[PDB]
Amino acid sequence: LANFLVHSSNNFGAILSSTNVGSNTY
Amino acid sequence: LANFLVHSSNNFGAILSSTNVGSNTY
Amino acid sequence: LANFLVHSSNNFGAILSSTNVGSNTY
Amino acid sequence: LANFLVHSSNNFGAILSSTNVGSNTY
Amino acid sequence: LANFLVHSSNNFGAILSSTNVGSNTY
Amino acid sequence: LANFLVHSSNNFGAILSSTNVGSNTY
Amino acid sequence: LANFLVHSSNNFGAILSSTNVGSNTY
Amino acid sequence: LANFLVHSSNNFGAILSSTNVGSNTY
Amino acid sequence: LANFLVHSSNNFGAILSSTNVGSNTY
Amino acid sequence: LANFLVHSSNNFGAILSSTNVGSNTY
Amino acid sequence: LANFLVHSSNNFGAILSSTNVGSNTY
Amino acid sequence: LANFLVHSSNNFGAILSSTNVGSNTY
């Protein structure tokens, strides 16, 4: 169980919240 | 169980919150 | 159980909060 | 149980808070 | 049980707070 | 039980606070 | 005379190219 | 005369190229 | 005359190339 | 005449290349 | 005439290449 | 004429290559 809370303002950069069970490339 | 709370403002850099069960490349 | 709290402002550098159960490359 | 609190401002360098149960490369 | 508190400003260098249960390479 | 408090400013060098239960390479 | 050439791909962080003749805040 | 060429890929951190004739705060 | 060439990949930290003729704060 | 070439990969720390003709604070 | 070439990988610490004609504080 | 070549890997400490024509404080 994963819980993500993201409160943001004036955001230019990328914000990434994720769960990668297996293989992933960014 | 993973809990992530991210409070941010005036953000330029990338903020990454994640869980990698297996293999991952950034 | 892992708990992450990140309060930030005026951030240029990358901020990474994560749990790597197995193999991971950054 | 791991608890991470990161309060930062004017940050250029990378800030990494993480738990590596097994093998990890940075 | 590990508790990490990092208060920083004007940071250029990398700040790493982590727990390595097993093998890890930086 | 390990407690880490790091108060820093104008930091260029890497600051590392960590607990290595087993094998670790830096 | 200022010349800026920015070739980028897969960009998450903010890329800023600018000329500040006088006072500026980021 | 200032010339800036920035070729980048897979960029997370902020990349700043700029000329500050007078006073500037980052 | 200042010439800047920056070739980068997999960049998390801030990369700053700049010319400060007068007073500047980072 | 100043020439800067910066080739980098897997960079967390801040990399600064600059020319300060007069007064500067970091 | 100053020439700077910086080839780096896996960098956490700040790398600074600069020319200070007059007064400078780091 | 000053030439600087810095090849580094796995660097935590600050590496500074610079030319100070006049007064400088670190």
For residue J9, give both structure tokens.
Answer: 């990969």
One-letter amino acid for residue G17 of the chain? S
For residue K9, give both structure tokens.
Answer: 């990988």
B13 to chain G: which residues are within 8 Å by CB?
A: 13-14
Q: How far apart are CA C8 and CA G18, in angstroms?
A: 25
End-to-end Cα, chain A, rounded Å: 23
* Residue K21 distance to chain F (closest CA, Å): 22
Nearest CA in chain K to F13: K13
Nearest CA in chain G to H22: G22
Would you say how long chain B is, in residues?
26
Q: How far apart are CA I15 and CA J16, in angstroms?
A: 6
Q: Where are the beta strands (DSSP E) in C1-26?
A: 2-11, 15-20
Q: How far apart are CA H16 and CA I18, in angstroms?
A: 8
* Residue G15 distance to chain A (closest CA, Å): 9
| Contact flag D26-C26 (C-beta cutoff 8 Å) | yes
Neighbour count for residue G18 (Cβ, 10 Å)? 13
Give F19: exposed, middle or buried? Use CB within 10 Å, 0-12, 13-18, 19+.
middle
For residue C11, give both structure tokens.
Answer: 């951030």
Please check whether residue J15 is in contact with residue L8, taking contact to mean a CB–CB distance below 8 angstroms. no
Q: Where are the beta strands (DSSP E) in chain K?
A: 2-11, 15-20, 24-25
DSSP B1-26: -EEEEEEEEEE-S-EEEEEESS-EE-
Q: How far apart are CA H21 and CA G19, in angstroms?
A: 8
One-letter amino acid for residue E2 of the chain? A
Query: Residue A22: which of C21, E9, K25 has the closest Cα?
Result: C21
According to DSSP, residue D25 is labeled B
Q: How many CA atoms lie within 13 A of D21 on its CB side?
A: 13
Distances (CA, A) of H19 to F26, G21, I19: 37, 8, 5
- CA dihedral (K10, K13, D8, G19) positive or negative: negative
Three-class secondary structure of residue I1 per DSSP: coil
